[PDB]
Amino acid sequence: HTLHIEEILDLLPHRFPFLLVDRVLDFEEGKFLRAVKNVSFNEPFFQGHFPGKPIFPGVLILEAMAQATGILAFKSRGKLEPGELYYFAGIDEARFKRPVVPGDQMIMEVEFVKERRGLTRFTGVAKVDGEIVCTATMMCAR
Amino acid sequence: THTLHIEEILDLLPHRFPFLLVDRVLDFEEGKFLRAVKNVSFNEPFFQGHFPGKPIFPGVLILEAMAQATGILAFKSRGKLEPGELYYFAGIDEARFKRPVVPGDQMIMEVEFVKERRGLTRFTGVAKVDGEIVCTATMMCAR
Amino acid sequence: HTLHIEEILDLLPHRFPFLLVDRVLDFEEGKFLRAVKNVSFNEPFFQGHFPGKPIFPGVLILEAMAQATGILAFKSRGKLEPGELYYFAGIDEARFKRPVVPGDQMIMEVEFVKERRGLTRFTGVAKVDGEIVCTATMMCAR
Amino acid sequence: THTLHIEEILDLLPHRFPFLLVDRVLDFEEGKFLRAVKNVSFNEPFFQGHFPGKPIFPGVLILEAMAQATGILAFKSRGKLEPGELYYFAGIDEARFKRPVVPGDQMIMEVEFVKERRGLTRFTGVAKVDGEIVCTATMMCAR
Amino acid sequence: HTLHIEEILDLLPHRFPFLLVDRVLDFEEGKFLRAVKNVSFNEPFFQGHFPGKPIFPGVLILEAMAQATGILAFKSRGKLEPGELYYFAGIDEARFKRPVVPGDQMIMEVEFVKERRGLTRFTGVAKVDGEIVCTATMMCAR
Amino acid sequence: THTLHIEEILDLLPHRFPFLLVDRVLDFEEGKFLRAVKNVSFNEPFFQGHFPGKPIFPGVLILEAMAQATGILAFKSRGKLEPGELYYFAGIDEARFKRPVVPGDQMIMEVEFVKERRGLTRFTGVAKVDGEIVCTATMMCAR
Numbered sequence: 043h044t045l046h047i048e049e050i051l052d053l054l055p056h057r058f059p060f061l062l063v064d065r066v067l068d069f070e071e072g073k074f075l076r077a078v079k080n081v082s083f084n085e086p087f088f089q090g091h092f093p094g095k096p097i098f099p100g101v102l103i104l105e106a107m108a109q110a111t112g113i114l115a116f117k118s119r120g121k122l123e124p125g126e127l128y129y130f131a132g133i134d135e136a137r138f139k140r141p142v143v144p145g146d147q148m149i150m151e152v153e154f155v156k157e158r159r160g161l162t163r164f165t166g167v168a169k170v171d172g173e174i175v176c177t178a179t180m181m182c183a184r
Numbered sequence: 185t186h187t188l189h190i191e192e193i194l195d196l197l198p199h200r201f202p203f204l205l206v207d208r209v210l211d212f213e214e215g216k217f218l219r220a221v222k223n224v225s226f227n228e229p230f231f232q233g234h235f236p237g238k239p240i241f242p243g244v245l246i247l248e249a250m251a252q253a254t255g256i257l258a259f260k261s262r263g264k265l266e267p268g269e270l271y272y273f274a275g276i277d278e279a280r281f282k283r284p285v286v287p288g289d290q291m292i293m294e295v296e297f298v299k300e301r302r303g304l305t306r307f308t309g310v311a312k313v314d315g316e317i318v319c320t321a322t323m324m325c326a327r
Numbered sequence: 328h329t330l331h332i333e334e335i336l337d338l339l340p341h342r343f344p345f346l347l348v349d350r351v352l353d354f355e356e357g358k359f360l361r362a363v364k365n366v367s368f369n370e371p372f373f374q375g376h377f378p379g380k381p382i383f384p385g386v387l388i389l390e391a392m393a394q395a396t397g398i399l400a401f402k403s404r405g406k407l408e409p410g411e412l413y414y415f416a417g418i419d420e421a422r423f424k425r426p427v428v429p430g431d432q433m434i435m436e437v438e439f440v441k442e443r444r445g446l447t448r449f450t451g452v453a454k455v456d457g458e459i460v461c462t463a464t465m466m467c468a469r
Numbered sequence: 470t471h472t473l474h475i476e477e478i479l480d481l482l483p484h485r486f487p488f489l490l491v492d493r494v495l496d497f498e499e500g501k502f503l504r505a506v507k508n509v510s511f512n513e514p515f516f517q518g519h520f521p522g523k524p525i526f527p528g529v530l531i532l533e534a535m536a537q538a539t540g541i542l543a544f545k546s547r548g549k550l551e552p553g554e555l556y557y558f559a560g561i562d563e564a565r566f567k568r569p570v571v572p573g574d575q576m577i578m579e580v581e582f583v584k585e586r587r588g589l590t591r592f593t594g595v596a597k598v599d600g601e602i603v604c605t606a607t608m609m610c611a612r
Numbered sequence: 613h614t615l616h617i618e619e620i621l622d623l624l625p626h627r628f629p630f631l632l633v634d635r636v637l638d639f640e641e642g643k644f645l646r647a648v649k650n651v652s653f654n655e656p657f658f659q660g661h662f663p664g665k666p667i668f669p670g671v672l673i674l675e676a677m678a679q680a681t682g683i684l685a686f687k688s689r690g691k692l693e694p695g696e697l698y699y700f701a702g703i704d705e706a707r708f709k710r711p712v713v714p715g716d717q718m719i720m721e722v723e724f725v726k727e728r729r730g731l732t733r734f735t736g737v738a739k740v741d742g743e744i745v746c747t748a749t750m751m752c753a754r
Numbered sequence: 755t756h757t758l759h760i761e762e763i764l765d766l767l768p769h770r771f772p773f774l775l776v777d778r779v780l781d782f783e784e785g786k787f788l789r790a791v792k793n794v795s796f797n798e799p800f801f802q803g804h805f806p807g808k809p810i811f812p813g814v815l816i817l818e819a820m821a822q823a824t825g826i827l828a829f830k831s832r833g834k835l836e837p838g839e840l841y842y843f844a845g846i847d848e849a850r851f852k853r854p855v856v857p858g859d860q861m862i863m864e865v866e867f868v869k870e871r872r873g874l875t876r877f878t879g880v881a882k883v884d885g886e887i888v889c890t891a892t893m894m895c896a897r
Contacts, residue, residue, distance in 0.1 A: 080287070125807075272423075
């Protein structure tokens with residue numbers, strides 16, 4: 043089940059310049075979601091990060107993966123009511139393996155692990171050209 | 185085999201944010217062709233205005249992206265621009281917009297040198313998404 | 328019949344940074360429209376096009392003229408319903424005659440030609456200080 | 470007769486996007502006056518916020534534009550700024566906002582040197598649209 | 613009575629990049645209001661003002677103070693109806709005493725003076741670290 | 755006692771708008787700690803998107819701000835970056851987001867060097883608003 047940007051705008055509250063999921067390529071509710079973030083030079087953070095040497099910030103890969111958990115959570119468990127937020131509570135073992143750059147299509151896979159102590163736990167893995175560029179464990183809650 | 189990443193691109197084109205619309209060069213043969221990629225992301229500044237609730241990559245920016253790709257080919261083939269000189273975009277023939285390009289699309293653009301004629305350099309461009317043609321055009325430029 | 332920016336926002340769906348018609352100076356439904364685009368240094372594309380040498384992109388003159396056809400079409404033939412778009416299908420014989428720069432007031436005249444094979448055909452002419460800076464033939468459709 | 474286009478302006482003022490608010494200089498006489506243009510376009514970044522659905526050029530930015538025009542006059546008349554030096558805006562007397570300036574307006578601004586007094590340079594500014602006064606103010610600056 | 617940003621968005625029509633009141637620290641209707649503007653490098657005007665030497669424009673201190681008069685006026689006298697504006701009619705004796713810079717928290721105090729000849733008159737004083745950086749007298753009207 | 759204002763910061767970090775998220779350095783001791791300020795303003799570009807009607811400083815940007823503060827400490831302590839070299843952000847352990855940071859907050863960040871181990875430099879960060887902890891994390895970086 044693919045979701046394009048209009049479906050994504052309907053599910054997440056994030057807007058420009060902080061909506062970092064461009065497409066959902068597949069998902070299974072309560073299990074996994076696979077999303078794309080297209081990395082382009084024409085994104086506003088690249089001016090600053092860095093002048094002459096565009097590097098996609100590692101913190102935004104964490105953000106983009108956490109957004110993809112949001113989409114899975116909303117498809118799986120129900121949409122947010124207006125004014126409610128899906129909290130990003132924490133991150134374990136964020137590892138940045140190599141630089142993500144303009145022209146990269148970052149494919150992100152997030153998996154639901156469990157609920158434990160009031161949080162929902164996901165693992166994320168981001169790849170470019172089949173190679174892992176980032177992993178992390180993310181905790182979120184409604 | 186002959187790829188250019190963004191730093192190489194920044195060194196050849198004078199365009200900068202928010203109007204540098206070539207993100208990679210996949211291959212090229214001097215004086216002949218260049219195949220480039222434009223990654224289309226929601227996170228691009230024009231999407232706020234085009235259109236609210238329904239992001240559509242403007243057709244004019246596909247023409248722009250292709251014209252930039254001709255620039256890269258021209259510079260690699262014929263010599264870099266000196267400081268303060270521009271590669272003019274003089275005109276366009278037969279621009280055809282076939283279907284909408286959207287966030288998540290990777291737009292692969294192929295430009296071919298045709299000829300010099302009457303003080304202009306003529307190129308044809310074809311932009312594809314997922315193998316299907318989204319735009320074609322004939323572009324005239326000059327130093 | 329002049330239209331100012333609030334009337335223009337009501338007719339076109341374009342918003343910042345891609346609404347490139349600042350005023351309508353006159354029009355006659357089904358025939359012609361004359362619009363202004365004020366070119367200012369304080370526009371976001373100028374940072375990029377080019378550093379140290381601001382040049383209004385020729386593609387944006389095409390865009391601004393196509394927007395002015397939109398306004399004529401909506402005034403002449405009826406407003407778009409929400410979610411509907413006015414397609415830009417093609418361009419013939421776009422000619423860029425000289426550079427448009429900050430401080431220029433670009434006056435654009437678009438004329439309806441005909442409907443043919445499912446498209447509406449317009450010609451556009453953009454002038455600065457009475458001199459032609461661009462012409463083009465534009466095809467659009469609902 | 471004495472016009473300065475944007476490149477000449479960039480060379481005299483240190484202001485850059487999104488706070489360079491003089492688009493052309495129509496005429497000037499050193500030590501006396503300068504007449505400049507600010508083209509007011511919807512496509513300017515502050516219009517998104519001022520205000521949603523009702524674009525109104527902020528009155529504070531007319532003061533800013535006029536103060537920039539004094540800068541140009543001062544530099545042409547008295548000498549360019551050296552790198553790292555600033556032309557301070559020290560104060561303002563009797564700023565009066567007469568009617569709203571909007572997208573599509575070309576705001577013609579005329580600034581006149583009055584005198585130096587008490588370590589400041591005093592100027593009067595008048596901004597017009599379609600021949601009518603939209604703002605006046607007396608501006609004090611110093612090197 | 614403190615107002616945070618959501619309360620501020622409800623009262624003023626200003627939006628990004630021209631909403632220059634970040635918090636209200638106290639107020640008394642018809643009398644005074646004390647507001648904060650946090651000055652950060654990450655604000656869009658700093659790119660332009662100036663490259664290599666960030667200086668908060670003195671005109672934006674005037675703006676931010678005039679916004680704080682707006683908030684006082686709306687809390688004191690009633691909210692604007694949609695489409696109505698609170699006019700900034702004029703300024704007397706704007707004095708800029710020293711440069712405001714990134715990292716500064718500008719505390720602004722505005723006081724109602726009187727209504728006279730169809731305008732409402734306020735005085736404003738902006739401080740950083742207890743020292744006055746700007747004063748002005750502002751005239752506004754519905 | 756050892757404060758660095760924005761110009762000193764621009765000279766040490768390569769980050770520029772819209773991703774320079776240290777506005778001042780309040781104090782530091784080389785090889786030991788650095789205490790910095792991030793002023794959180796509505797007028798920052800990410801607030802438009804995060805979220806419409808409910809501005810919330812992204813937790814990922816607190817991690818970024820703290821990692822930038824480690825950079826400053828590292829450069830002051832160990833030597834500036836040469837042109838074209840980067841200070842890599844290699845990973846993060848135990849990032850905890852305790853309560854939302856909002857416009858008007860001044861976020862005071864304290865980073866401490868822990869050790870070098872296994873080719874990385876390890877730091878702990880703590881960010882506070884009004885004396886209360888809003889985020890903690892352990893950050894690994896390397897030249």
